[PDB]
């Protein structure tokens, strides 16, 4: 029913509004706490972190609180109780902080870790297909080489060249005759095979939880660069190889067929028209299945590359979530004399979010009370 759908839609939109207003409130409280630590007053900051955790717990039923904001409060409160103690009063909640932080980190990382596992597993069926298909194709004397050869022999090569050219116009200037096509296709197949070996090796060498030199290199390269993105990290270098292989597996202006595959399709079409031995047609058909498998493998290899890249991005997101506001010395950075300007902006942000949250929770309570 569209009415139960309407009530659900109004409740979801309203709940999201409560969630955003609470996110803005908690964000302002954490910022104000970060200033108190910069000033030196560790106790006043601890009260704000404790309020962040208290408010999130109170509203956990009605709305969700960003795990990173809760982790920001939990971790920085733990930092004060491990070192700055006994300046901060103890509470019966202090013992739970370590496990809560670990749970928040685990919950946040769960998606990117599952996506690494799923992207890795997704590659096995297509790779087994590629191994099965390559067993059925002759490497030394391929079907298309023997089709070209017999076409030149019986002087039906002109019809073949015209049929290959018509399929392209639907690097044709790179070959004049059938022998020119033969050598051009040899080079293009060798190039594809070299592109495949390299892209697979590039992916293989990005697997596994990466080292600190890799995390930091990717961060200064494309996550948080000093100015413009560097495009020099192991992931960016691998993507340059993917682009190179894509330009040969597909055509420019990943969906449209390459000129190599188009030529191969036309040679197979010519072989069928001229009623060549079933062996040539079968091998040609297997080559078409192989081009299909290579395109599927490309997409799955790039998704696996993406999953591994995203895991590095997520680890940086975790590190940045716990990072506090620090006054710049000659993001979480404040100018030498903008400390008061930041405090004022945060105090007004808290005031507006407190007001918006009260209004939105009242409307949410109304929508909830219709079902009784
Ligand atoms: Zn990079």
UniProtKB/Swiss-Prot annotation:
Disulphide-bridged cysteine pairs: none
Segments crossing the lipid bilayer: none
Domain of life: Eukaryota
Tissue-by-tissue expression: Broadly expressed.
Effect of mutating residue 30 to Y: In a melanoma cell line
Stated family: Belongs to the SNF2/RAD54 helicase family.
Domain notes: The RING finger mediates E3 ubiquitin ligase activity.
Known role: E3 ubiquitin-protein ligase involved in DNA repair. Upon genotoxic stress, accepts ubiquitin from the UBE2N-UBE2V2 E2 complex and transfers it to 'Lys-164' of PCNA which had been monoubiquitinated by UBE2A/B-RAD18, promoting the formation of non-canonical poly-ubiquitin chains linked through 'Lys-63'.
Oligomeric form and interacting partners: Homodimer. Interacts with HLTF, PCNA, UBE2N and RAD18.
Identification of the protein by name: E3 ubiquitin-protein ligase SHPRH
Origin species: Homo sapiens (Human)
């Amino acid at each position: 029913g569209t009415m139960e759908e309407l009530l659900t839609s109004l409740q979801k939109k309203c709940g999201t509004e409560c969630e955003e207003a609470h996110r803005q409130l908690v964000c302002a409280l954490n910022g104000l706490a970060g200033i108190h630590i910069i000033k030196g007053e560790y106790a006043l900051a601890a009260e704000l972190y404790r309020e962040v955790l208290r408010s999130s717990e109170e509203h956990k039923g009605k709305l969700k609180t960003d795990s990173l904001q809760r982790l920001h409060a939990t971790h920085n409160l733990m930092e004060l109780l491990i070192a700055r103690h006994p300046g901060i009063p103890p509470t019966l909640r202090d013992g739970r902080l370590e496990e809560e932080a670990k749970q928040l980190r685990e919950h946040y990382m769960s998606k990117c870790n599952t996506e690494v596992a799923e992207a890795q597993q997704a590659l096995y069926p297509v790779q087994q297909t590629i191994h099965e298909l390559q067993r059925k194709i002759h490497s030394n004397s391929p079907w298309w080489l023997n089709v070209i050869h017999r076409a030149i022999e019986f002087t039906i090569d002109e019809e073949l060249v015209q049929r290959v050219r018509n399929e392209i116009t639907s690097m044709s200037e790179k070959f004049r005759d059938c022998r020119g096509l033969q050598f051009l296709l040899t080079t293009q197949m060798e190039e594809l095979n070299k592109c495949q070996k390299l892209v697979r090796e590039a992916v293989k060498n990005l697997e596994g939880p990466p080292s600190r030199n890799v995390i930091e290199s990717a961060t200064v390269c494309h996550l948080r660069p000093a100015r413009l993105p560097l495009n020099c990290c192991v992931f960016c270098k691998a993507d340059e190889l993917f682009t190179e292989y894509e330009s040969k597996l597909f055509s420019n202006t990943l969906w449209a067929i390459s000129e190599t595959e188009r030529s191969m399709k036309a040679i197979l079409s010519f072989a069928k028209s001229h009623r060549f031995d079933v062996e040539f047609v079968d091998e040609g058909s297997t080559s078409m299945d192989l081009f299909e498998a290579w395109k599927k493998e490309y997409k799955l290899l790039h998704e696996y590359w993406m999953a591994l890249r995203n895991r590095v991005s997520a680890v940086d997101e975790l590190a940045m979530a716990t990072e506090r506001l620090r006054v710049r010395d000659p993001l979480h950075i404040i100018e030498p004399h903008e400390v008061e300007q930041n405090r004022i902006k945060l105090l007004n942000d808290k005031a507006v979010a407190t007001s918006q949250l009260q209004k939105k929770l009242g409307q949410l309570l109304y929508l909830t009370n219709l079902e009784k």
